[model samples]
Target: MQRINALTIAGTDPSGGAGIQADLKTFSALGAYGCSVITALVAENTCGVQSVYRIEPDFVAAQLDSVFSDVRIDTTKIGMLAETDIVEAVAERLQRHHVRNVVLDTVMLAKSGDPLLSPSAIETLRVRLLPQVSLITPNLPEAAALLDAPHARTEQEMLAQGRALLAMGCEAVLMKGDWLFTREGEQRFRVNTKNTHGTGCTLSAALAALRPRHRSWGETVNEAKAWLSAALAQADTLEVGKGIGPVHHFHAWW
Candidate 1:
């Protein structure tokens, strides 16, 4: 079989727990050839984000051009876009390539509650990028930000907004955790630990990696969440940082 090509357009987490670090790990774990175009250089760790150095639109565009010109990306997972211009640049480039199975992980804040995406940039993502993707994997807070409403804590509310988000232009929306909504009732996983730092990024990358093989979104989601749940179960074993750590990306191996 031909190798799956997965592209991640996002920021870097030097600590290796989130952003492009987590994203690339997921893609590689799922056996996809991973490529990346960094939108920002984040100074962060499992603790929190201290600062973000935004990548200019020109460089972002140049990276996109480099990837699409030589590689045939089967799917894309977009994460933390720190600026309005970067969001617009990525959206335009994806549209130009007519990229399919695009997974949008609307990363808004760090695990330690520091904002990663700016308000104006979120607005730009809503207007210019939301419609172009295949699926959006938003945590409760991210979904609320996108809808400009309160967080959906109950199943009824998430169900209502899941329908609402489909009207926003994306093919599908999977509100991760907290009354999850998507192709079906979301999978149930046993509570592992507070080390859920890269869960969202991992899920979105897994979705992009598996999307092409499945006929429906539910199949892909089930497979991805199962893997994540297993990883979360193994999270406490890996002592990476003093604060909340990341789930094991290679739990299937040693």
Candidate 2:
């Protein structure tokens, strides 16, 4: 089998549960060579995003050019674009290089309900970046923010957001079901345990890593979600961090 190369332009999650850290974990677990450009540095652990400092957009672009200049980048993933300048710069470069199999997580907010990207960044993402990606993976709130709706709380909502994102420009969109709620009774709607840290990051990275192995993008995402579900089911076992821990990236599913 030929080794796959994947590059991630994202922020640093010192917790190792999300952002570039999670992207690398997924790439490594899935047997791909991973490279990264740190866009922001967050003082964080498993619990949540604590604080963030933006690296200069020029430096971020420099890191990307340094990698793509000498080496070949097969698949790319983008996350946590702190500023619109950063978004436009990366978008233009990716378009220029014709980087295929790109994944955009649309990192506009945090799991704790803080904004990782600003309104201007979101505009750049849709207008400048969305069309450049093969797939865009947005959680319900992120999708809702992009589509200007409420969080998707059910399977129908998930599909709706996915399809709506497809209308924007991407070849495909995965409105993640991790945040979906199932109705139990008149007064209860239970959420699943899949909301651990790094869930979206790992899934998107896995999709990119498995792309060259699969024949089609749809097939890659279908199998990737299956893989991600199994990972989430066993997430609590990894014991990587105290709070919302990550799954064992290398756990083989049989």
For every model shown, what is its TM-score relative to the native structure? 0.92, 0.86
Query: Would you give me the overall lDDT of model 1?
Result: 0.84
The 10-residue segment with the lowest total lDDT in model 1: 180-189
Count steric clashes of candidate 1: 0
Q: What residue runs in model 2 are displaced by over 4 Å at the alpha carbon?
A: 149-161, 178-195
TM-score of 1: 0.92
83-129 per-residue lDDT for model 1 (tens digits)? 88999999899889999899998788766676666788888888889
Clashing pairs in 1: none
| Top model number, lDDT | 1
Q: How far off is residue 9 in model 2, in Å?
A: 0.9
Alpha-carbon runs more than 4 Å astray in model 1: 178-189
RMSD of each predicted structure: 2.3, 5.7
Q: Per model, state how many residue pairs clash.
A: 0, 0
The candidate that wins on TM-score is: 1
